Design a protein around this ligand. Structure first.
Ligand SMILES: COC[C@H]1O[C@@H](O)[C@H](O)[C@@H](OC)[C@@H]1O
Ligand SMILES: COC[C@H]1O[C@@H](O)[C@H](O)[C@@H](OC)[C@@H]1O
Ligand SMILES: COC[C@H]1O[C@@H](O)[C@H](O)[C@@H](OC)[C@@H]1O
Ligand SMILES: COC[C@H]1O[C@@H](O)[C@H](O)[C@@H](OC)[C@@H]1O
Ligand SMILES: COC[C@H]1O[C@@H](O)[C@H](O)[C@@H](OC)[C@@H]1O
Ligand SMILES: COC[C@H]1O[C@@H](O)[C@H](O)[C@@H](OC)[C@@H]1O
Ligand SMILES: [Cl-]
Ligand SMILES: [Cl-]
Ligand code: NA
Ligand code: NA
Ligand code: NA
Ligand code: NA
Lengths: 344, 344
């Protein structure tokens, strides 16, 4: 099992609007977007992209600005749907085949080719990629092996090498990396040790280091980071304390200070942030209230403010954001969302 | 002729350090970099990359994080030098041949291939590109025609199409764009009218629109923007007032508010900024003091603060940056820099 998942995928679009993707009771993918590129913009409301999915739907932005959404289908294949033009209309759902047993994880190679990572029936990590920048057709499926028990997460190093993170059968954090940008050549799997009870979250720091956050065996938030830009050795695990009842979400303030969000024991949203600078010590955990039934999802908007989404007790998506002094009261974006995570 | 040029090229590197490139009295390219990814970091001091150049040296970051510097040689060919590894050592200077009559202008295509633009002996716009992502070999040279009387500037649209801007023989702003990302297919040249007396500066707004700044016939700062994301029609010219005696420089605050810098009639650095938000009205012009002998060069650092470089009366490079309340007093980074601009 893993800590309670994020309920939506969010992106800050090429025209600076937040757009959220979730799963309805009907197992279709629904999306909601800001009208305007500003904190507190009015929202479209929920509209259906249809499909029938059995994973979290995961949006990624192509290097040409076109959104593309990846999800496991009811047939256990990887499916996708994409904008035919930047912030315009959508394709039909198309199958990329395979059989997958996790949420997909996506990143652009330095050459503009999306690469998708997902667990297989064998609990190994599999991958498939665009054969040309921001376009089909796609490569054959292949395996990067391992034995994983969490959803995988991918990020790019500051030298353009993709790196993937996942929990192992021993409940340690494991990782594997490209040996060169855009490559089909990967490292061996390596253990970063620890005992983790959530999906891992990966972010690039202002100084080009990967930093991974995960819930610990004690339900505290832990983190570990590359000690040199795009390189090991890693720091070894450090606790950020708290007692959290969901997966964490992490985003960068516009001054690059990291901020972590998670559900607390009182079912409120809690957060901890770097103080002073992106090199600064972490704050005490503080409450942002709400009563939430999912992990929070955090994103920086076009005004450089953090916005956080979470499911409420009514199964609506609710939203709070940074103000000059504080955070805004929770508002409802409505909808009825399910946790469709392929791993729970 | 054109307004007095920027003296350096600056980048925020893949490990969040500012690195500045200039030309010495010896016509070699010199560089200076922050030790640490923070406002007020100590600097390396000036070190030589050698070469013998007759343009502003222009640094660009490859999609794999490797810096690459482009300059016209004393032989009037395009030359370049690149990091062999991300924030590591440098190649030898290599010729990309051709004959050019402007500073080079560089952007990455969505597929990771750098494309370089420079004026020819015929005063047409010429271009050359990497044949593969972040690597040689390079394409043949070819012309995009036109007749230009300023250094060209290139930016990518929010839909991944490169667009180039330059002053025409009629002193209007002209532009030309790719018809598709990564394409060799371009539009016809189109006039945006106006009368401009500086190189144009181009920036992408938070909402995915190109906005161009240039000095006017009245030595005021003017600007014009795409009215729709990655699309015409354009806004038509609007004055931001001031009386400026250098080219302008523009950067984005970490909340995406645009800020323009230029030398004033008193030879001090002056600036004007968007107030409230990236959609907000522009401030009155205010002084940041100094006595400068170049256009300013503006960049946002890893702490989300603007830093501005300018040549002093002693021909040293000086530096001021945003503080909580104000701006820091000018400090000297030393060196002896010349304006090597291929167009003055
Ligand atoms: C990232 O996991 C950190 C874990 O490190 C382990 O070595 C500790 O025994 C354990 O403490 C209960 C932590 O959860
Ligand atoms: C973020 O959740 C907002 C919640 O606010 C709570 O105070 C309400 O009782 C409850 O009302 C349905 C909401 O779910
Ligand atoms: C994201 O919300 C989608 C839901 O919208 C609701 O308004 C519908 O009643 C419901 O259809 C049964 C959908 O699941
Ligand atoms: C961008 O140039 C704006 C120019 O627009 C011209 O139409 C004006 O006559 C002229 O006013 C003196 C401005 O410099
Ligand atoms: C940015 O320029 C700083 C200048 O400050 C001036 O106040 C000094 O007189 C002068 O001293 C050499 C410097 O060039
Ligand atoms: C960027 O500064 C480079 C200059 O460094 C100076 O210290 C040297 O005297 C001078 O060599 C004649 C260089 O041009
Ligand atoms: Cl668990
Ligand atoms: Cl002039
Ligand atoms: Na954006
Ligand atoms: Na905060
Ligand atoms: Na950077
Ligand atoms: Na300012």
């Amino acid at each position: 099992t893993i800590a309670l998942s994020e309920i939506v995928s969010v992106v800050n679009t090429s025209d600076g609007r937040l757009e959220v993707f979730g799963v309805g009771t009907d197992k279709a993918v629904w999306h909601n977007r800001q009208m305007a590129p500003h904190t507190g913009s009015p929202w479209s409301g929920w509209s259906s992209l249809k499909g029938q999915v059995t994973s979290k739907p995961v949006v990624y932005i192509n290097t040409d600005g076109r959104l593309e959404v990846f999800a496991r289908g009811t047939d256990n294949a990887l499916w996708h749907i994409w904008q035919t033009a930047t912030n315009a209309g959508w394709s039909n759902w198309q199958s990329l085949g395979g059989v997958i047993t996790s949420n997909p994880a996506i990143y652009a190679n330095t050459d503009g080719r999306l690469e998708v990572f997902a667990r297989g029936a064998d609990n190994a990590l599999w991958h498939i990629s665009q054969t040309t920048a921001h376009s089909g057709p796609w490569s054959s499926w292949a395996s990067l092996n391992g034995v994983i028990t969490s959803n995988p997460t991918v990020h790019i190093n500051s030298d353009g090498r993709l790196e993937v993170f996942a929990r192992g059968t021993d409940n340690a954090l494991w990782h594997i990396w490209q040996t060169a940008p855009d490559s089909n050549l990967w490292s061996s799997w390596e253990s970063l040790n620890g005992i983790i009870t959530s999906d891992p979250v990966v972010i690039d720091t202002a100084d080009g280091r990967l930093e991974v956050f995960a819930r610990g065996a004690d339900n505290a938030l832990w983190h570990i980071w590359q000690t040199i830009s795009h390189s090991g050795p890693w720091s070894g695990w450090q606790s950020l304390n708290g007692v959290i009842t969901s997966a964490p979400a992490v985003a960068k303030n516009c001054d690059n200070r990291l901020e972590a969000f998670a559900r607390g024991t009182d079912n409120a949203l809690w957060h901890t942030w770097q103080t002073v600078s992106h090199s600064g010590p972490w704050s005490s955990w503080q409450s942002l209230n709400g009563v939430i039934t999912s992990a929070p999802t955090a994103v920086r908007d076009a005004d450089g403010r953090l916005e956080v989404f979470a499911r409420g007790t009514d199964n609506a998506l609710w939203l709070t954001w940074q103000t000059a002094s504080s955070w805004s009261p929770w508002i409802s974006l409505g909808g009825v969302l399910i946790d469709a995570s392929a791993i729970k």
